Amino acid sequence: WRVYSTGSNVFQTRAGCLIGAEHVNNSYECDIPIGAGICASYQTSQSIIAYTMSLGAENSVAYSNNSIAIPTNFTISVTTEIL
Amino acid sequence: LIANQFNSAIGKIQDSLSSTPSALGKLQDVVNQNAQALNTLVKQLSSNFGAISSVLNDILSRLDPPEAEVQIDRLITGRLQSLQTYVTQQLIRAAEIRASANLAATKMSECVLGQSKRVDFCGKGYHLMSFPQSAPHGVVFLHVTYVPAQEKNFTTAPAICHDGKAHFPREGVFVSNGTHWFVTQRNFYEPQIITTDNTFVSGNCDVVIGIVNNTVYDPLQPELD
Amino acid sequence: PVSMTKTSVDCTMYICGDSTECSNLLLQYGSFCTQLNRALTGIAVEQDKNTQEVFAQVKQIYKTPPIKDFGGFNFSQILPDPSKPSKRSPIEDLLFNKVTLADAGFIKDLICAQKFNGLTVLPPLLTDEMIAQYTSALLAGTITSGWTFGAGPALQIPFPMQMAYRFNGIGVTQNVLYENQKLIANQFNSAIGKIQDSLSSTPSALGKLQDVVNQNAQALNTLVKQLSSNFGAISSVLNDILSRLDPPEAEVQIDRLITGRLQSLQTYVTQQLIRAAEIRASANLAATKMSECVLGQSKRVDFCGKGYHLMSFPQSAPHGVVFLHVT
Ligand SMILES: *[C@@H]1O[C@H](CO)[C@@H](O[C@@H]2O[C@H](CO)[C@@H](O)[C@H](O)[C@H]2NC(C)=O)[C@H](O)[C@H]1NC(C)=O
Ligand SMILES: *[C@@H]1O[C@H](CO)[C@@H](O[C@@H]2O[C@H](CO)[C@@H](O)[C@H](O)[C@H]2NC(C)=O)[C@H](O)[C@H]1NC(C)=O
Ligand SMILES: *[C@@H]1O[C@H](CO)[C@@H](O)[C@H](O)[C@H]1NC(C)=O
């Protein structure tokens, strides 16, 4: 086949290079693992996009030497697990 | 309140399993793998392994046995080697399933029949109890856990000096609104007044880093005075 | 150990290297190579699952505050250093220098010869700079939130008060700590320095990692040696047999070569399956240790180091994890 080798959206990764996907600047969670931190998905007007995977939300906790945080209210949670 | 949260949570388990189709994949793949492997074995009957044909009754009805020995030997070698490969792969998968079964037995013994205190062994959060249910070739646990979520901030101190002596919480921690001081258990905000009967005295208050000056109410003195 | 190096084997390049007659004779053996490729890609998936299971324990990335008023303690050897392109602790740099990894396989040795016969090395899913991000996040969460971030939202709490809680978990009254803070701080800092220089001086510490790589390397290496045995034919080079004999009798030689190479390949794959099961068992052990010795305070004896356990700190190593137990 040769209908994809035309390209014009070619993207070189640490695993090789990718043809038929358009490199983005965001960071999402992983859908299909490609490798070296790069994942790909089918989204939006629809196409296949590839990205650096996103490890999670950034967070900062307000530490001090005389500050504590305490909870006031509570929640009961039920989860499933299959073996 | 806890009853309503529990019932709503159970209903959410029910409709969450009823709506999501991809939940039970950990079971299904196992059956699929065995199915796939067994199916492969059947279509190993159709390869000739380099002989005339893969049907044995053809070769018996075409040749005399001085040469049927030569052809049949090649068939025997091929089929026997394929069967050996199938048995070895089934042995490895059996060892894996046995490991998962011992894990399941450990979870049944600890997360159900007692109350475990290992973190994240019986679901996420502090563990309250469990309930088991059956599944085709498997088990499904419902963990019921306790998650605290509404936080607020206070300013503390490791100990209280009252009379040249340090006072420590018998259980809990000292907290301050900004004006007063209270003793609170570590997972639920509830002020109680700092008395003698939830504290104890040890040493003097010239050693501990960051001790703050306050007073400790005595439960005997206004009864006596 | 956590994972081994993902390896992919291509049959038709390995067995019948560029010979149409050889492959046409090979398709009489049915669907072996699909099974072999399926087993290898099963192992290759399982490695990524193992690393994801060990390190992706939380789902938020905390950060340490810049100020270092931790009551006298000094975490300078396990906190990340912004002075390097690889955002690591110096302890992690000692770990990255002590293991002499191999099998580069760069984009264009013995590695090139391994490349030329259908043996490829798939790169891992998680790079070396995201594992560091998880490990630094776990360090940040442990030193600023106690164990509350292991059960819900992060709750800040001063560090010596957390250490008072942790002595109260052992069976020691907490006033022991507050009257002896400086002594504990000095012992902790001296002990951390002893870990650093003891690991720096001893070369033979990390053998549990190294042997794993060596075994896989050795196994892969002996596979290439099996290309040089003739298995009872007149020669071991396939192009010789095609360039000397007519095909109606070269079938006899080529069949013997197919049998020998296929049997050797099968043996290699069975051994790699058993090693995969072993590494998976050790990975589940590592996940249990990360859940219990780090995110909480275990009370099982000698599960979290020798003595009464206080806390732990994880650090990353190439294909593995290293725990520091503080006891
Ligand atoms: C503690 O949490 C519970 C549950 O989140 C709160 O109960 C809710 O109260 C509001 C009042 O406006 C009701 O609308 C909700 O229906 C209640 N929840 C349930 C599940 O019934 C409770 O108010 C919280 N405590 C405080 C002091 O705010
Ligand atoms: C924590 O310990 C580190 C040990 O590395 C201290 O860093 C040293 O600080 C001294 C003081 O000037 C320097 O002479 C050394 O060169 C530093 N070490 C290195 C490897 O560069 C650090 O000061 C300590 N931090 C605290 C807060 O005590
Ligand atoms: C807390 O930190 C502040 C820094 O401004 C310092 O002045 C104070 O002495 C510290 N207190 C304790 C108990 O560490």
Residue numbers in the entry:
A (entry chain B): 633 to 676, 689 to 727
B (entry chain B): 922 to 1146
C (entry chain C): 728 to 835, 848 to 1066
Paper text:
We identified residue 417 as potentially a key difference between the two spikes: in the closed SARS-CoV-2 trimeric spike, Lys417 in the RBD from one spike subunit forms a hydrogen bond with the main chain of Asn370 in the RBD from another spike subunit, stabilizing the RBDs in the closed conformation. In SARS-CoV-1 spike, however, this residue becomes a valine, losing its capability to form the hydrogen bond with another spike subunit and potentially destabilizing the closed conformation of the spike. Thus, we hypothesized that a K417V mutation causes more SARS-CoV-2 spike molecules to take the open conformation. To this end, we introduced the K417V mutation into SARS-CoV-2 spike ectodomain and purified both versions of the protein: K417-spike containing Lys417 and V417-spike containing Val417. To stabilize the recombinant spike ectodomain, we introduced six proline mutations into its S2 subunit to lock up its pre-fusion structure, introduced mutations to its furin motif to prevent it from being cleaved during molecular maturation, and added a C-terminal foldon tag to facilitate its trimerization. For the K417-spike, 55% of the molecules were in the closed conformation with all three RBDs down, whereas the rest of the molecules (45%) were in the open conformation with one RBD up and two RBDs down. In contrast, for the V417-spike, these numbers became 32 and 68% for the closed and open conformations, respectively. Therefore, the K417V mutation allowed more SARS-CoV-2 spike molecules to take the open conformation, confirming our hypothesis. Further 3D refinements using the good particles generated a 3.8 Å map for the closed spike and a 3.9 Å map for the open spike.
